[PDB]
Each structure stands twice: as C-alpha cells, then as structure tokens.
Design a protein around this ligand. Structure first.
Ligand code: HEC
Ligand code: HEC
Ligand code: HEC
Ligand code: HEC
Ligand code: HEC
Ligand code: HEC
Ligand code: HEC
Ligand code: HEC
Ligand code: HEC
Ligand code: HEC
Ligand code: HEC
Ligand code: HEC
Ligand code: HEC
Ligand code: HEC
Ligand SMILES: O=N[O-]
Ligand SMILES: O=N[O-]
Ligand SMILES: O=N[O-]
Ligand SMILES: O=N[O-]
Ligand SMILES: [Ca+2]
Ligand SMILES: [Ca+2]
Ligand SMILES: [Ca+2]
Ligand SMILES: [Ca+2]
Lengths: 520, 75, 520, 74
C-alpha cells in the first residue's frame, strides 16, 4: 500500500511545482502516486539532482482515481478497420503509389485506428524500422489494453543484439527517427530537451539511434499530454507546437488575434543545472483544438533538402522538428520560409513536399471553428446519463458512434439519418475531386518519361517540375487529412480544383513540347 | 479547490484513526475530502472536542475518485 | 418401395466390396439403395461384367438416411456474392486483365459461391464452353436444390446438334476439357480410368470431346467423394491427389513425415478384365485437410508448353492432369520437375505459370495446421444444440457465419468482434501487398512495348521475361488463394514482397536499357 | 457463492481496467457475468428456464398456502 511522503520537504526545493500543485485540483494528491524519490531526497542539493527519482509515465497512474476516463480512452473501436493500406482502389488514395513514388510512405501507409495502438503501430508499420519490430503473434493485434500497458509486452525485436536501422524484409523502409516518437508517447518527457536539441541533461535527442530510443518507450498518448499532473489544469507538452504558438509568436489561432488572446498558451520552462531544458504550454481554457494539435497537424519530423540549393537537411537541423502551423493556401510560403522540401519524385524528379494529417490547420476558418466548436465537441463529447455523474468520453472516434451527443444536440432540426447524409454529401463530393486530382497528376507523371526520351529540354522539364510541386501540394493535403473534406469543405474544393488546374497546365506544357520534338 | 490539512496533527489526538488510515489503501487520502475540522483544530484538546468538526456523508465524497462505482450504483 | 437383394450373391464375385461393406457402418445398408443389378447378376461371370448394373450417383441416394447432412450441404449462402468478376477495382485483383493477358481467365473469373452450384457454374462461365451453356433463364441462378438435382434440369445447350467447342458469343473462350470435371462432379467415377488415361473400359478420358462428356454429368460434389459408400469410412477419390500422395510418395503432409504416417492414405485399386482401372485412397482418419485437397489445390488441368523448348503439351500428356503438391516457395521447382508452363503473356511474351486456389498447400506449416487444426474446424464444424443429436454441418462457408463453433470455442479470450478484427487485420494487410504487387507488375508490363519499340535487345527482354515468371508466381498465388492471406499470413507477406522485388528489378533493367537506346 | 456473484459481479471488458458493478439487480440483466461464467453447459435461455422452473413452482405453493390460510381465517 502507498504511504504518503512529506510534500513540504519537496517544495523546499521545487518552488515551481509548489506554485502549481498547491493551487489546482490535485492539491490533495500526494507525490507518491507518481514519484519514488526517497534516495533523491537524501542526495539532492538545491541545484543538483543527486540520485534520480523514479517518475511513473504509465496511464494506470491516473486510472486509480479516474477509472471512467481511462476505460473510455483504452476502448478499441473494432469498426475502425486495422492495417488498411490507403494505396488501394477502395481506400483514400487509389493512385498513391504512382504519385508518392520516391517517398518512404510508398512502403506502407495504413488508415489510422484507435489511439491505444499508436505506439505499437508506429513500431510495426513497414515504412518505419525495416520490419525489425512485430507483434508477438498475429493475435496480439486486438490487444488495446496490452499496448497501453506497454509496447514491449506485445511486441518482439528481430535482433536485440544490434541497434542499427536496417531492412529485415525486402519491402520495408527505415524512415523512423526520434522526432516521430513525440507524437506517439511522452514517456521521454524528462529525457528530451526542448525541440530535441543536444543537451547535457538529455539522454535522447533528434540525433539519437532511434532503435535504442524505441526500446526505452512503452506507453501511448499519456494522460499528462493534455493535463498537467501537478495542477490538473489544461496544457500541451509538444515542443513543436509550443515553438509555433509561442516562440514564433503565431498564436493558438493564427487567423484570429482576439481568440488567440482569449484562448492562449503560457510557456513554462524547467531547468537542469540552471540552464533551460524542457517546456510545457499551459492553456487559458480546456481547449481541445490546441490539445489535439499536438499531433493532428502537418509537420516536419524527418530529414529533407533545401529548395534553394538541393542540399541535405539532416536530423541535426532544427528544421527536422517543425510545425508549419499554416493552412493549405499558406503552406508553400511556410516551406519557402524554412527553405525545405521532403523528397524528389522518383519518376518526375520534382522537388515535392510530403503532407501529413493537417486536421488542425484545415479546421481553422471553417464554419464550426468560427462558431467556437472544437475537436472534442464532435470526437470526445460529454457522456449523457439518465442518472449519474457526467464525465467526458475519452474514446476519440468518429461522431457517427454518438450522434446524439456529437451533432444532434446542436442540430435539433435533423434526425440522425439527415445528419449522416449531410456528412456523406461532403465526403462523396470531396473524394470525387481527390480521385480526379489523382487522375490528372498521374497523366502528368506518365508524360515525364515520354518527354525525357523524346529529348524535351531541361528548361521545359523544370517548368513542369515546378507545376508538379503545386499540383502535389493541393491534392495531397486532402488524402493526408482524415475528414475527407468535412472539416472545411469549401477549402478542400478550392484546393483540389487548383491541383487539377496545375496538372492540366503541366500536361499541356509536356504534350506540346513532345509534339514539337517529334515534328523536328 | 480543496487544500490538504496536516493529518499528522490530527493523529496526535486520533490514534485510533491513525492506526486504520496509515495502514490501508486510503493512506494518501487527505482528511479534507470528508471532514471540515478547521475550527475543531483551533479549539480542541485531546480531552475536549471543542467545536464539532463537520463530516460529509454524501456519496459524492467518494464519487470524485471512484466515479465508476458511483455511476453504477445510482443507475 | 425398395426390395432388398441378396448381398451374399454379389459378394461371391465382389470380394473387395465384401471386405469393406461387412466391416464398416454400412454393413446393414442393402445394395438396392444405390445399385440396380438384376440383369447384371443374370449375365456376369467372375471376370466379365455382362450387362452393366445401374449405379446411383445422385446425392439424394444418401439423403434418405442422412437428411441433416444433405440439407446442410445444399444450403445456398446468399451473402456469397454470385457471378462477381475478380478483375474489378472492388474485388480481388483490380489489375488482373493486364497481368493475365494471354490466358483464358481474362474472359471471366468470378469469386467462388456455394458448393451446390459448382457444376452449373463450371458449365456457364464465359471462359469454359464458348457460351454454349446457359441457365434456362436468369431466375434459375438462385436454385441450389435444382442444380444438385441435376445440371441439365436448370441449363440449356445452344446447339444440341453439334459437339464441337466453339464460341457462341464473341468474348468467350473454350478452356474446358475433361480433366476440369474431376473437381466438379464424380458422376463419371466408373467411366474414367485413373488419371484419365486411355483405357478399354473407360468411356471418357483426358482426350474426350468435352461437350459430349459434359452432357453425361449432372451432380455437384457427390457425397461419396469423401465417404466410401461401402464402408462409410473416410476417403478421397481424386486421381491427381492419390498420384501426388501415394504414387509419387510425397505423403499427405509433405513437410511432416510423422503426421503423414499417422494421417496417411491407402490406395485401393479396382480392375476391369483383370487390368487396373480406377482407384480410391482410404484415409487413416477423417482428415478434412486431405478431403478438401481433392479440389482446393494448385493443379494442371489443361494443355500448356515445355519450359525447355517451348513445345506444346496436349491433353494426351499425363502432365495435363497433375497436382504439384508444393507450397509457393517450392512451386517453381515443381514446375521445372515436369518441364511445364501454362501460357505466354500477351504483352511481355514471358512464359508464365497459371496458379489456382492453392488453399491446401498454403495452409501447410501455418500456426493452425501445426497445431492439428483442419479445414472442417473452421469451415464445417459440429452443430451445437441445446437438446439434440450432434451432427457435422456440411455447409462449407466462411467461419464468420458460425464464429461460436468455428473460432471462439478455441479462442475463449476473444469476443466475436475481436476475432473478426484479427481476421480483417491480416486480410487488409495482405490485400494491400497484393495491390502493390499488381502496381509493380503493371509498371513492368507497360515497359515491354516501350523497350521493344526503342530497340532494346532480345537478351535484355529475355532477362526481363525470366524476372516476369517469378514476379507473376509470387503475386498470383495470393489472388488465386481465397483466404486473402489468413491461412498463412507470414508466407503471403514474404511471397508478395518477393513479387515486388522481382518487378522492381525488371523495371530497373528495362528503364536502363531504354535510356541507353535513346542515348545512342 | 455470495450475493455479489449474482447481483453485483465484476464488469467484463474487451479492453480496460476491471471494476465491480455496484448496480445491485437481478442477474437476468447480466447473465454472462452472473451465471453463465460458472454454468458453461447452459445457454442464457436454459439458465432463465431453470430460474423460472423454481419460481413458478414456489409461487404455486405460495398461492395454495394463501388459499388455505384464507379458508381458515374465514
Ligand atoms: C532540494 C534539496 C531538493 C529536494 C528536497 C527535492 N528535490 Fe527533486 N530535484 C531537485 C533538483 C536540483 C533537480 C534537478 C532539476 C532542477 O530543478 O534543477 C530535481 C529533479 C526532480 C525530478 C525530475 C527528475 C528527472 O528525471 O528529470 C522529479 C520528479 C523530482 N525532483 C521530484 C521530487 C519529489 C517528489 C521530492 C519530494 C519527495 C523532491 N524532488 C525533493 C532538488 C530537490
Ligand atoms: C487520486 C489519488 C488521484 C490520482 C492518482 C489522480 N487524480 Fe486527477 N483528480 C483527483 C481529484 C480528487 C480531482 C478533483 C475532483 C473535483 O472535481 O473536485 C482531480 C481532478 C482532475 C482533473 C480536473 C481538473 C480541473 O477540472 O481543473 C483532471 C484533468 C485530472 N484530475 C487528471 C489526472 C491525470 C491526467 C492523472 C494522472 C497523471 C491524475 N489526474 C491522477 C484525484 C486523482
Ligand atoms: C499524439 C500524441 C496525438 C494526440 C495528442 C491526439 N492524437 Fe488522435 N491519433 C494519433 C495517432 C498516432 C492515431 C492513429 C493511431 C493508430 O494506431 O493508427 C490517431 C487516431 C485518431 C482517430 C482515429 C481513431 C479511429 O477510430 O480510427 C481520431 C478520431 C483521432 N485520432 C482524434 C483525436 C482528437 C479529437 C484528439 C484531441 C482530443 C486527438 N486525436 C489527439 C495521435 C494523436
Ligand atoms: C505529430 C506531429 C506526428 C509526428 C511527428 C508523427 N506522426 Fe505518425 N501519426 C500522427 C497522427 C495524428 C496519426 C493519425 C492520423 C493519420 O492520418 O494517420 C499518425 C499515424 C501514424 C501511423 C498509423 C497510420 C499509418 O500511416 O500507417 C503510423 C504507422 C505512424 N503514424 C508512424 C510515424 C512515423 C514512422 C513517424 C516519424 C517518421 C511519425 N509517425 C511521425 C502524428 C504524428
Ligand atoms: C488530450 C488529447 C487529452 C488526453 C490525452 C487526456 N484527456 Fe482528459 N480531458 C480532455 C478534455 C478536452 C477534457 C474536457 C475538458 C472540458 O472541460 O471540456 C478532459 C477531461 C478530463 C477530466 C475531468 C472530468 C471529465 O470531464 O471527465 C479527467 C479526470 C480527465 N480528463 C482524465 C484523463 C485521464 C485519466 C487520461 C489518460 C487516460 C486523460 N484524461 C487523457 C483531454 C485529454
Ligand atoms: C464536428 C463539427 C467536428 C469537429 C469540431 C471536428 N471534427 Fe473531425 N470529423 C468530423 C466528421 C463528421 C468526420 C468524418 C467521420 C465519418 O465517420 O465520416 C470527422 C473525421 C475526423 C477524423 C477521422 C475519423 C474517422 O473516420 O475514423 C480525425 C482523425 C478527425 N476528424 C480529427 C479532428 C481534430 C483533430 C479536430 C479538431 C482540430 C476535429 N476533428 C474537429 C467532425 C468534426
Ligand atoms: C481520492 C482522493 C479518493 C477519495 C475521495 C476516496 N478514495 Fe477510495 N481509494 C482511493 C485510492 C487511490 C485507492 C487505492 C487504489 C488502489 O487500487 O491502490 C482507493 C481504494 C478504495 C477501495 C479498495 C480498498 C481495498 O481493496 O482494500 C475501496 C472499497 C474504496 N477506496 C472506497 C472509498 C469510499 C467508500 C470512499 C468515500 C467514503 C472513498 N473510497 C474515497 C482514492 C479515493
Ligand atoms: C440408410 C438405408 C442409409 C443410406 C441409404 C446411407 N447410409 Fe450412411 N449410414 C447409415 C447408418 C445406419 C450408419 C451408422 C449410424 C451409426 O452411427 O451407427 C451410417 C453411417 C454413415 C457415416 C458415418 C461412418 C463412420 O463414422 O464410420 C457416413 C460418413 C455415412 N453413413 C455416409 C453415407 C453416404 C455418403 C451415403 C450415400 C452414398 C450414405 N451414407 C447412404 C445409413 C445409411
Ligand atoms: C471439388 C469436388 C471440391 C471439394 C472436394 C471441395 N470443394 Fe470447396 N469449392 C469447390 C468449387 C468448384 C467451389 C466454387 C463453387 C461455385 O459454384 O462457385 C468451391 C467453393 C468453396 C467455398 C466458397 C463458398 C462460398 O460461400 O462462397 C468454401 C468456403 C469452400 N469451397 C470450402 C471447402 C472445404 C472446407 C472443403 C473440404 C470440406 C471443400 N471446399 C471441398 C470445389 C470443391
Ligand atoms: C481441382 C484441382 C480443380 C480443377 C481441375 C478445376 N477446378 Fe474449377 N474450381 C476449383 C475450386 C476449388 C474452386 C473454388 C475456388 C476458387 O478459387 O474459385 C473452383 C471454381 C471454379 C469456378 C467458379 C469461379 C470462377 O473462376 O468463375 C469456375 C467457373 C470453374 N472452377 C471452372 C473450371 C474450368 C473451366 C476447369 C478446367 C479448365 C476447372 N474449373 C478445373 C477446383 C478445380
Ligand atoms: C468432403 C468434402 C465431404 C463431402 C463431399 C461430404 N462429407 Fe460428410 N463428412 C465430412 C467430414 C469432414 C465429416 C466429419 C468427420 C469427423 O469425424 O469429423 C463428415 C461427416 C458425415 C457423417 C457422420 C455424422 C456427422 O458427423 O454428421 C455423415 C452421415 C455424413 N458426413 C454424410 C454426408 C452426406 C449425406 C454427404 C453428401 C450430401 C456428405 N457427407 C458429403 C466430409 C464430407
Ligand atoms: C480456421 C483456423 C481456418 C482453417 C483451419 C481453414 N480456414 Fe479457410 N478461411 C478462414 C478464414 C478466417 C477465412 C476468411 C473468411 C472471411 O470471411 O474473411 C477463410 C477463407 C477460406 C475460403 C474463402 C471463403 C470465403 O470468403 O467465402 C476458402 C475457399 C477456404 N478458406 C478454404 C479452406 C480449405 C480448403 C482449408 C483446409 C486446407 C481451410 N480453408 C482451412 C479460416 C480457416
Ligand atoms: C446466484 C447464485 C444468486 C446468489 C448467490 C443470490 N441471489 Fe438473489 N436472486 C437470484 C435470482 C436468480 C433471483 C430471481 C431474479 C429474477 O429475475 O427472477 C434473485 C432475486 C433477488 C432479489 C429480488 C430481485 C428482483 O427480482 O428484482 C433480491 C432483493 C435478492 N435476490 C437479494 C440477494 C441477497 C441479499 C443475496 C445474498 C444473501 C442473494 N440475493 C444471493 C440469484 C442469486
Ligand atoms: C455493500 C452493500 C456495498 C456498498 C454500499 C458499496 N460497495 Fe463498493 N464494493 C462492494 C463489494 C462487495 C465490492 C467487491 C469486493 C471484492 O473484492 O469482490 C466492492 C468494491 C469497491 C471498490 C474496489 C474496486 C472495485 O472492485 O470496483 C471501490 C473503489 C468501491 N467498491 C467503491 C464504492 C463507492 C464509491 C460506493 C458508494 C457509491 C460503494 N463502493 C458502495 C460493496 C459495497
Ligand atoms: O538510423 N539512425 O538511427
Ligand atoms: O506518420 N505519422 O504522421
Ligand atoms: O475441344 N475438344 O473437345
Ligand atoms: O477454375 N477452377 O479452378
Ligand atoms: Ca480510422
Ligand atoms: Ca510534412
Ligand atoms: Ca465466395
Ligand atoms: Ca495451375
């Protein structure tokens, strides 16, 4: 049984913790629930850590007093199809292999499934670790509670004796690097300096061997990613997000200075040997838009190349951990601002961006966002009970599973079938434009080998490559974003029409140049 | 927001509660969750209650940390 | 009403039948249930047949005493979509037409449906008889009991006056030959010599006119294909299977000599004029793995060509009736062993194999097979009754329809939804690799005309054709096999990655050769 | 066996932390957890039938007991 420790003794040194803990809703929650610090207290000084105390990062540290939120969080939505490859005719991007050729995502890119699996899915996907990690057997794929208990309770490593990234099966890639883990777990929150900079007090950084890092990590989406464990108040911990909102001064709502002020973030920094080490961002309000934007954003988390001179940008560069914090129509400018692109297309040779799940930046400016609606209203609403203490569902999933609480409470004029029909009208129309965009991109891509082989000039091929950048961006945003246009249908429509226009321009340019060569 | 009380000071006069509380699974659960004893502590001796402390009997006193058991009960 | 005949009188001549009938569970079942032999008894000698007795092959001969098994067998699973073409974006092989071009399957290849329809579906598919046979009208497609009663009760022949194979509609083929029928019916069991060799006592053989043969056949999957009618004991009758297991000495489990010994087969031969004529294989145990492997295997049942010299191998050759009895990683060696391939690709000119539903050979070595599980455990389990005499379901279908009896009885840790999720994780991942394999095959195939037209050398085109063989085999195994990887997911994954690797090698070879030609 | 085994059993979850139901009620609402876990030989309908056999027989004897008490009282 737990025995409480004297917190006043800790507070003698830990004034920041004291200021947070004594004021918030965890003022009665003793440190022993999450820390074992006996030898630490015996050996620390006011500025030196001494022996390092143990800190629990497991979600069961909170499940003892908050069982309802924990049990809701770990639920597995079996209807969210698992390991479902997006590059197929029946999924999101039928022509993805042709369009993304040259990028690691061509090796495998599945649809998202329930949050319990994020860290295990990161470890086992074919594009990440060369196939090094696998579930212990094919039955473990169902075990959400198990993954939450710890990745290494349900996974195996093909070679515990080596720590290099390499292929264990032929059609894999080794795209994983330490920055990825920041959107899968925060078990390393005390072992990682802000932004993943080299730091004397950090065990891990952007330049670590990712296989060694991986082995030290266990839990998905820790409860404390959105809730400060000391004050119980709302916060974010993701360094890339804090850097965009605070360091770069862009605000929580870059298009709306007023809302940014009302719903802002305060950066709090913690030190090691009196030098800045790690930071959190305390939120003015429990604003899920900003909490979910710790991960559901377009980012860089990988090496790439400079737009200016084509030279390599490695994990050591700050650009390898970056939130663009820009909507699709500001993205090209945001990438120029850091002089960066992701890959060269295997067939066209064009410099291209790689886009990732930009839900937060898409939602900006939408009718719902402008009316003060936030991700949690549709994806993790209050539970409705005939008799009971209300709590917030923590099973983040499509609103189709709880339409009464997620939509119909605000849309009293609709039945459930009418609301579903409205969602499907947008998704159907948007998907049709994604498919047309891919058709035009593919038609352009197919013309590059023909044009090269017919002796079309580099100048013309380079003009087509510049068009490919825009055709790609204005399409890939929407296969990356998970709502199939629902979060911002007018924006999806305008962007996808732009993609098509750019591809058509490129097709015309290449067809005319090929025809002229043949005529000579 | 609740502010914890000095449980050790209570135990100077409440050895019977001490022997139960310090040993079981509520050893970390501060008295302020269920008792309002400020004026009691100001006025008591080990041999004189002084002002009577307040004790919560409402089931919500338990529902803060045990919402699942409470919600299942009230169905 | 039936009147019993004196069996002792038959046994005077039929000592093999006597030894089987008097010992097994049909010792009380009189011959008159299946044979009308009055004129036979009057005219036969100990070595000459005399007048030929009538033998019932209809399944209703068994339905009289085994109504539950019969009624279960003839059920139609309406959820198994009928006449569903595999070469479409929403079915198993979106790029099948490009990949299989040159083979008869391009004319039509539908997904399997319930067993009642096997013989009628064989007769009416567009690739089989030039469109000669059709259901009497489009309503008869529902009539499972009717098909069982007899193919010719529900079908029409466009020209009863001719017996040649020819096209009656433009987009048909005439791929059917007498060997096919062995996996659709055994109505010809007394009229077909072992392997379909020419034989004085056989009316039909590999070289028969298939249209004439077709007209003599009526019933699908006769009950006696798995059950000896004389002993009621377990058996197989399929000559190709007996030839692999017994004549070639490969055993019932080629990867496991011990299991092969415990679960073996004894070949029993029947003679005509004291020369060997037909054979059956009695099983040591009621082992459904071997019973279902009478048909659910990769086979040759068609003419083809020799790998060595390209020369024609016709129906007259023993190779036209052949069970490879090899897993996907031993198949290329098994085809070299008989010096055989199926067709030349219409676009690439490569010699290619054609693979067919290799469920039995895929299942070998899987976790379930290694633990003693067999096809019937998942596809035709015991019926569970609150009060009743238990019998075995004979409706062979996906376990999704009886998850309590087919999975959850062994997997007590799972709910039905969790078990379904585990199956779908494998099928989704496997299908994504099938789709990627087809993408790479198609990219290679498309380069052949470009390379030929650019003047790439025969030596390079032949190197690419040798790669095409392997790229094709390691892909087509999985579109042919019906479990979408479930029967052996690690094997499907390794094979599909091999297919992709081979295609990528071929693409690189061809792109480089085309580029070099253009540079000259 | 104790009252809680039939009237406030542990919750069964595909994924989650087990806790004890505190909704004290008839086992007919949670037969999987209140009976069928110990009585593997039964379906839910069979277990309900066994309950109703006892209650039907008992209630019949209650009614007959009241008939005779009423006849005496009168
Ligand atoms: C002064 C003598 C201290 C007392 C008493 C306690 N701690 Fe401490 N702690 C101290 C220092 C100088 C540091 C390094 C960081 C800094 O502020 O300069 C720490 C660090 C921690 C940590 C972080 C450990 C890590 O892995 O990074 C934790 C969780 C921690 N301390 C907890 C803690 C608790 C619970 C105490 C009372 C039981 C406590 N500390 C006493 C200095 C001192
Ligand atoms: C019991 C010993 C607790 C442990 C361990 C944790 N929490 Fe807690 N939490 C506790 C209480 C008594 C309260 C206040 C209840 C009330 O409403 O008065 C809380 C409150 C929270 C809140 C709400 C905060 C707010 O609204 O301002 C959150 C978000 C919260 N707690 C989260 C949390 C997490 C993430 C934990 C694991 C690190 C955790 N709590 C542990 C009791 C206990
Ligand atoms: C980084 C730590 C994340 C935060 C914070 C949130 N999400 Fe998330 N989400 C994340 C990943 C890595 C995944 C895929 C997990 C996998 O194993 O595939 C997801 C998935 C979702 C989904 C899909 C769930 C399904 O049933 O398929 C939804 C609806 C979702 N995420 C929403 C969501 C919301 C609303 C958030 C703020 C409350 C949120 N997520 C935070 C990574 C992270
Ligand atoms: C936060 C900015 C993220 C970083 C950095 C990484 N990922 Fe991620 N991931 C993120 C979200 C919000 C989701 C769910 C939404 C979606 O569109 O998928 C994911 C999902 C995954 C998955 C599951 C889906 C799939 O693509 O197969 C995998 C396997 C995954 N992520 C791996 C991954 C790797 C290898 C990363 C570094 C290169 C990486 N992620 C970074 C959020 C974030
Ligand atoms: C961000 C992606 C979150 C993670 C991870 C966790 N929770 Fe949460 N929590 C979140 C939101 C948006 C809210 C609602 C705030 C509002 O006022 O609208 C909550 C709320 C809580 C509470 C308060 C009581 C309630 O409303 O349910 C508690 C006790 C709480 N959350 C606990 C909790 C635990 C234990 C988690 C890990 C399993 C957890 N939260 C993760 C957002 C996020
Ligand atoms: C209601 C007005 C919504 C708000 C606010 C947010 N989202 Fe959403 N989302 C919404 C719908 C109707 C859909 C389509 C769901 C369907 O079943 O068709 C989505 C989709 C998602 C997804 C994918 C979910 C899935 O299909 O499994 C994700 C990952 C998601 N949304 C995330 C998300 C985030 C992070 C938000 C705040 C920035 C957000 N959504 C707002 C409805 C609503
Ligand atoms: C949070 C501040 C709490 C309040 C208020 C109450 N309890 Fe509690 N309880 C709490 C914790 C952290 C634990 C230990 C969890 C663990 O598993 O270690 C408990 C435990 C219980 C138990 C189980 C005890 C045992 O098995 O020996 C019971 C029956 C229990 N608590 C009941 C209970 C009641 C009736 C309360 C209101 C008077 C109550 N608790 C308040 C945290 C908190
Ligand atoms: C009634 C006159 C029968 C006809 C016609 C057929 N069978 Fe039969 N069968 C019959 C009996 C009385 C028994 C034994 C029942 C018992 O369990 O004691 C059987 C048994 C079978 C078995 C089980 C054999 C074994 O377990 O060893 C099979 C597989 C079987 N019968 C099949 C069968 C088939 C395929 C028939 C048509 C050719 C057929 N039977 C006819 C009674 C009668
Ligand atoms: C040759 C005589 C066969 C034997 C012996 C078995 N099967 Fe079969 N199967 C066969 C054919 C020709 C077909 C397709 C029939 C059609 O008209 O399309 C099938 C089909 C199946 C299916 C699919 C059923 C559905 O609902 O779609 C299954 C699940 C199946 N077969 C399984 C099966 C099992 C388990 C067997 C041994 C008990 C078995 N089959 C024997 C040909 C033959
Ligand atoms: C046993 C080794 C077989 C031989 C020889 C033939 N077929 Fe077949 N067929 C077989 C099985 C086990 C199945 C079901 C599984 C599947 O993948 O389809 C089938 C199915 C058919 C079907 C229905 C499906 C379709 O392809 O449209 C048809 C029309 C069919 N078979 C025709 C056919 C012809 C014309 C054959 C000789 C060239 C032939 N089959 C041989 C098993 C076996
Ligand atoms: C192989 C593809 C089969 C065909 C065709 C038929 N049956 Fe069958 N039968 C099969 C198996 C694998 C079993 C179970 C053997 C075991 O012990 O596990 C059976 C069983 C029977 C029985 C025995 C009683 C029972 O278990 O149901 C009978 C009477 C029987 N089968 C009859 C039967 C009839 C009448 C069929 C044609 C409609 C028939 N079987 C086809 C495999 C195969
Ligand atoms: C359980 C461990 C199984 C054993 C043993 C066998 N098969 Fe199977 N099969 C299994 C699953 C879970 C599936 C996918 C079904 C789904 O609905 O997703 C299959 C599929 C088939 C099919 C196609 C069925 C259909 O989808 O209609 C066939 C023709 C099939 N399997 C045949 C088969 C044979 C002949 C086996 C013994 C060699 C065999 N299966 C074993 C589960 C299991
Ligand atoms: C399972 C072996 C049981 C144990 C142990 C206990 N009870 Fe029970 N109880 C049981 C049944 C099958 C029924 C009839 C319910 C029905 O729907 O027909 C009952 C009934 C009750 C009732 C009335 C419940 C109602 O009908 O709403 C009460 C108040 C009740 N039982 C209390 C009770 C107590 C206090 C027990 C321990 C001493 C106890 N039961 C044990 C099954 C079982
Ligand atoms: C007697 C009639 C009870 C009342 C009133 C309350 N609870 Fe209870 N509780 C009861 C039993 C029989 C059990 C299980 C004991 C066992 O080990 O089998 C429980 C358990 C708890 C626990 C432990 C965690 C769990 O098993 O769920 C907690 C935290 C708990 N109970 C809390 C609780 C609260 C908050 C109540 C008032 C709403 C409450 N209990 C009433 C018996 C009784
Ligand atoms: O690939 N370096 O960890
Ligand atoms: O791949 N995760 O964005
Ligand atoms: O095509 N010969 O039957
Ligand atoms: O086409 N039947 O394998
Ligand atoms: Ca999903
Ligand atoms: Ca990006
Ligand atoms: Ca089917
Ligand atoms: Ca073949």
């Amino acid at each position: 049984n737990l025995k409480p420790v004297d917190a006043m003794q800790c507070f003698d040194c830990h004034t920041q913790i004291e200021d947070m803990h004594t004021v918030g809703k965890h003022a009665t929650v003793n440190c022993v629930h999450c820390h074992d610090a006996t030898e630490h207290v015996e050996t620390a000084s006011s500025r030196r850590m001494g022996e390092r105390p143990v800190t629990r990062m497991d979600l069961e540290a909170c499940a003892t007093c908050h069982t309802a939120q924990f049990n809701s969080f770990v639920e597995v939505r079996h209807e969210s199809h698992p390991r479902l490859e997006k590059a197929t005719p029946t999924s999101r991007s039928p022509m993805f292999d042709k369009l993304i050729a040259g990028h690691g995502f061509a090796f495998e890119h599945a649809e998202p499934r329930s949050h319990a699996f994020m860290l295990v899915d990161h470890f086992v996907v074919d594009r990440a670790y060369g196939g090094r990690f696998q579930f212990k057997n094919w039955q473990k794929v169902t075990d959400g509670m198990g993954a939450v208990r710890g990745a290494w309770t349900v996974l195996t490593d093909a070679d515990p004796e080596s720590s290099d990234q390499r292929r264990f099966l032929s059609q894999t890639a080794t795209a994983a690097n330490p920055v990825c883990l920041n959107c899968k777990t925060q078990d390393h929150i005390l072992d990682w300096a802000y932004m993943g900079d080299e730091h004397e007090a950090a065990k891990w950084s952007r330049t670590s061997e990712v296989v060694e890092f991986a082995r030290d990590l266990n839990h998905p989406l820790n409860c404390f990613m959105c809730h400060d464990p000391h004050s119980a108040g709302p916060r974010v911990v993701r360094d890339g997000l804090i850097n965009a909102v605070v360091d770069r001064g862009l605000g929580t709502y870059p298009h709306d200075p007023v809302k940014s002020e009302q719903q802002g973030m305060t950066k709090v920094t913690f030190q090691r040997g009196r030098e800045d080490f790690r930071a959190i961002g305390l939120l003015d309000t429990a604003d899920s838009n900003v909490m979910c934007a710790q991960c559901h954003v377009e980012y860089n988390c990988n090496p790439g190349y400079q737009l200016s001179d084509g030279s390599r940008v490695g994990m050591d560069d700050r650009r390898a951990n970056h939130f663009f914090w820009a909507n699709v129509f500001d993205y090209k400018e945001a990438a120029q601002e850091i002089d960066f692109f992701d890959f060269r297309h295997a067939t066209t040779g064009a410099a291209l961006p790689k886009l990732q799940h930009p839900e937060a930046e898409t939602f900006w400016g939408s009718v719902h966002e402008r009316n003060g609606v936030a991700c949690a209203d549709c994806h993790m609403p209050k539970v409705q009970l005939e008799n009971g203490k209300v709590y917030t569902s923590h099973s983040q999933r499509t609103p189709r599973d709880m339409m009464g609480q997620a939509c119909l409470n605000c849309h009293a004029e609709w039945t459930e079938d009418q609301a579903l029909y409205a969602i499907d009208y947008i998704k159907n129309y948007t998907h049709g434009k994604i498919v047309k965009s891919e058709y035009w991109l593919a038609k352009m891509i197919d013309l590059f080998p023909v044009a090269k082989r017919a002796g079309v000039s580099e100048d013309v091929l380079n003009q087509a490559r510049e068009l490919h950048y825009d055709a790609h961006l204005y399409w890939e945003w929407w296969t990356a974003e998970n709502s199939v246009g629902f979060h911002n249908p007018d924006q999806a429509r305008e962007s996808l029409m732009t993609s098509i226009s750019k591809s058509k321009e490129a097709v015309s340019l290449l067809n005319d140049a090929i025809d002229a060569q043949v005529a000579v």
